């Protein structure tokens, strides 16, 4: 039993016709102090899987090592390490899920909310969630923490049900994602303007965009807001 210290906020994601997209800002908060700013919370495992993590950062860093170790291990006595026997998103997830549950079961959780995004060897899109309690689930869109409340409502408008995936293009999808990130920057007091975004397409592979920024924000109307009711100037 612990309590998080340095933390990352929302991790949002969704799946389009060919792949999946996932994003997360680069902040590492320390309570209300926006302490660290160059924190990458998107962990690429291989190049068909990207793991987005939120929650306690020290635990995140720990889960990162576990992942790199998984890659090293899979390579041992494996002549098909980068072919038929390379890590699949589903493997990476099942592993993480297993670890997560064992830890909560021992009353010492890895204080995190995790989303595994990627493309299976057969082209299928993979997107599943797991948190410090070991709970898991899938949906056309997935977001942790604050993003579950604000990003999902938006993303679901694009892919509301299964039959919407094939109708959604990378442009449309990436757009929804980028807009959600803006909205989160508007109302989440633990968010940052900088974030990373990654695409896992069954054709174009893994595109990892670092150092993005929320652009095109509406703030002008703020000048017309004076007082809190009766004040006129």
């Amino acid at each position: 039993t612990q309590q998080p210290i340095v933390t990352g906020t929302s991790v949002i994601s969704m799946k389009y016709d060919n792949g999946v997209i996932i994003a997360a800002d680069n902040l590492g908060s320390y309570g209300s102090l926006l302490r660290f700013n160059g924190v990458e919370r998107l962990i690429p495992v291989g190049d068909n899987t990207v793991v987005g993590i939120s929650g306690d950062i020290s635990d995140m860093q720990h889960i990162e090592r576990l992942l790199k170790d998984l890659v090293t291990e899979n390579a041992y006595d494996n002549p098909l390490a980068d072919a038929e026997e390379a890590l699949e998103p589903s493997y990476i997830f099942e592993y993480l899920a297993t670890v997560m549950y064992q830890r909560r079961s021992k009353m010492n959780p890895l204080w995190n909310a995790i989303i595994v995004a990627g493309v299976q060897s057969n082209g299928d899109q993979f997107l599943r969630y797991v948190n410090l309690l070991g709970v898991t689930y899938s949906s056309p869109t997935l977001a942790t923490g604050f993003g579950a409340h604000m990003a999902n409502p938006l993303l679901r408008k694009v892919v509301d049900r299964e039959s919407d995936i094939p109708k959604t293009t990378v442009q449309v999808a990436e757009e929804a994602i980028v807009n959600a990130m803006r909205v989160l920057y508007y109302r989440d007091a633990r968010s940052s303007r900088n974030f990373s975004l990654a695409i896992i397409d069954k054709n174009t592979g893994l595109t990892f965009k670092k150092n993005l920024q929320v652009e095109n924000m509406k703030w002008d109307f703020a000048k017309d807001i004076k007082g809190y009711g009766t004040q006129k100037i």
């Binding site: 090592r65 170790d69 090293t72 390579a75 041992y76 006595d77 002549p79």
Partner: protein
């Protein structure tokens, strides 16, 4: 007297350890394998005897990797060889986990050495029936 060659950790009258020497015999009887140190890395090669047309070609890889930068090849009792590599992987993993940096080849060499030397200290164990060629590139070439 005699019989100084029946138990492992035993010193013969002339200061030798026959059990270890007998191990060498198993090694010498094995396939030939080598290692060449070029000027920015190392190369490993080995002989794979085609005991029969029944052996799927290319399918019984002998050379093994430790971590992501080390290579290992050995002659003698293959199973003993794998056993030593498993230890090496553990040792490399333990080292990285605490010092962060992947294990330097010189450090890895002594890890294997101390371990193998350990199997010549007790009569309750048998020495390794393999000689191993290994190496890699680190912070110092």
């Amino acid at each position: 007297g005699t019989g100084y060659d029946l138990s492992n950790s035993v010193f013969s009258p002339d200061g030798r350890n026959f059990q270890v020497e007998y191990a060498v015999k198993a090694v010498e009887n094995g396939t030939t394998s080598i290692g060449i140190k070029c000027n920015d890395g190392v190369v490993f090669a080995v002989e794979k005897l085609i005991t029969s047309k029944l052996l799927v070609p290319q399918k019984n890889v002998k050379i093994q990797v430790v971590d992501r930068h080390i290579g290992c090849v050995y002659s003698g009792l293959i199973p003993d060889g794998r056993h030593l590599v498993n230890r090496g992987r553990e040792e490399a993993a333990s080292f990285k986990k605490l010092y962060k940096t992947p294990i330097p080849i010189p450090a890895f060499a002594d890890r294997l050495g101390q371990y193998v030397q350990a199997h010549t200290l007790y009569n309750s164990v048998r020495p390794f029936g393999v000689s191993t060629i290994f190496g890699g590139v680190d912070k110092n070439g």
